[PDB]
Design a protein around this ligand. Structure first.
Ligand SMILES: CC(=O)Nc1cnccc1C
Ligand SMILES: CC(=O)Nc1cnccc1C
Lengths: 304, 304
């Protein structure tokens, strides 16, 4: 019992983290096989970042201008290409610690572990979600770019995020490992305002199921609702619409707890309309939306 | 920018996790050099746990009754002793992945990363604190016992916690790596009620400093207070007393932000008396007390 914001174990990903230096810019790279992945803005001065032409900036760079370091050993760079907003540096040595991995582009509402790195050295690991506005609310200083977001399925690391940008609002934008930004964000020091950070309704429900499973039941009410009726209230509260798909996804938690998804929705409805009145749920004063249904099942069942 | 509940990278500790089986009981062990540490209740049936005599239970156990597995390779057990509430199984092979490590007994209010394991396999990593009632609010199922709590100082893992007990209230008790329980808890399925879970006042202040540093300033007020005056209010709100030591510990955050500790206290005072009024601080509706001043400095500065 007890329910905690839980990152995947970082070990497998620690073994992939290198330091990438181009001129005076140092950030983090992901070393998988004989490729090192890093943000392409490693080639930018902070001045460049105002209006960078990455193809043009790149012409002035050779393999030997990319200094790649794993621990205190330098990797030889034998090739470089730009894929979207990432650089792929071909090194002459396949990472001996390469885990089984995939590159996956996650949907808004999907959670993942971030291994925050500085100079290719891990500082910590936290759990995030891809927000519906395709931002993430990370913890990232200067030098944290190239820090990656991942899921582990038993022994296979699915890389879903590379850290690129702080927005003027101190939220975060980055890419999948093909270099494509989540959302409409760009690797440029320009006006970039996030849209509405809506609450991930299915995640809140998953977490209400987690709460019931761990003995926090005070918010279970006598009401049910409909998808359409619940959704009117969701809209009003900047909650994502709930789909039949979300309901199906919650089925196993519905099954285990014997609370119909729509009854739980009616509980969530009342929590929205009526607030917490100073009570907590799993030690939170707000409705947590950074546990997926899969996160809840995993943590409630003890998958490894 | 952005501030996140951040565990240390788990890699170094993943490399230490083994499966300990005694008869029908399987839980987690910590393999450091040629010793495997696990809770002594590995030798108990759930029936034993009602009133176990561990010395007597132990007499009926030999080295070969302790089945230790690292990945899918069995370790040969060549000795066993009981130290307080842990077993130390001497194995014939020193863990090749033994990191630099210490055993440290932490104080209430100290935070640490937990690597939750099942059958010696890591499932996740979260950040906890030793509560003032010497419980922790973990996430632990059956088979999670022997999961450890740690800090990393650069490359040296300080092991501070081994998981032992769920209390009937679904909070957690365990030992340091010398087998001594935090608090008055015992490895017995008996009535064990925790005392007052008071808020770690210095940790809340550290986190209010973190918030100011990350642009959440709305709660900064025009008031100051005294230790004695603040403490009257702390008492009333089940907050730990604030000591001059706590003030000194917060000095560097005081320095960096230019907010005197006592002014921040006067801010905290008002937050207690007046609540959040539906506002959040670093995306929390309650005052977070599981970041230490050292946690805040680390995460705000980017130590690795
Ligand atoms: C270009 C950029 O945004 N770099 C960055 C990323 N994350 C956190 C802080 C910073 C300065
Ligand atoms: C003896 C004991 O308390 N075992 C345990 C520990 N942590 C979580 C769940 C359980 C059943």
């Amino acid at each position: 019992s007890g329910f905690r914001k839980m990152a995947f174990p970082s070990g497998k990903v620690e073994g992939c983290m290198v330091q990438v230096t181009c001129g005076t810019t140092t950030l983090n790279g992901l070393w998988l096989d004989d490729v090192v992945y890093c943000p392409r803005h490693v080639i930018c001065t902070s001045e460049d970042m105002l209006n960078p032409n990455y193809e043009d900036l790149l012409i002035r760079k050779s393999n030997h201008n990319f200094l790649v370091q794993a621990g205190n050993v330098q990797l030889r760079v034998i090739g470089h290409s730009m894929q979207n907003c990432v650089l792929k540096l071909k090194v002459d040595t396949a990472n001996p610690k390469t885990p089984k991995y995939k590159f996956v582009r996650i949907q808004p509402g999907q959670t993942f572990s971030v291994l925050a790195c500085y100079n290719g050295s891990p500082s910590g690991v936290y759990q995030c979600a891809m927000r519906p506005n395709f931002t993430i609310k990370g913890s990232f200083l200067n030098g944290s770019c190239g820090s990656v977001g991942f899921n582990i399925d038993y022994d296979c690391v699915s890389f879903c995020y590379m850290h690129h940008m702080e927005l003027p609002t101190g939220v975060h934008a980055g890419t999948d490992l093909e270099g494509n930004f989540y959302g409409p964000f760009v690797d440029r020091q320009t006006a970039q305002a996030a849209g509405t950070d809506t609450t991930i309704t299915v995640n809140v429900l998953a977490w209400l199921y987690a709460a019931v499973i761990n003995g926090d039941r005070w918010f279970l009410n006598r009401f049910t609702t409909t998808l359409n009726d619940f959704n009117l209230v969701a809209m009003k509260y900047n909650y994502e619409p709930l789909t039949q798909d979300h309901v199906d996804i919650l089925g196993p938690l519905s099954a285990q707890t014997g609370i119909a998804v729509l009854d739980m929705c009616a509980s969530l409805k009342e929590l929205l309309q009526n607030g917490m009145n100073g009570r907590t749920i799993l030690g939170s004063a707000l409705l947590e939306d950074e546990f997926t249904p899969f996160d809840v099942v995993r943590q409630c069942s003890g998958v490894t």
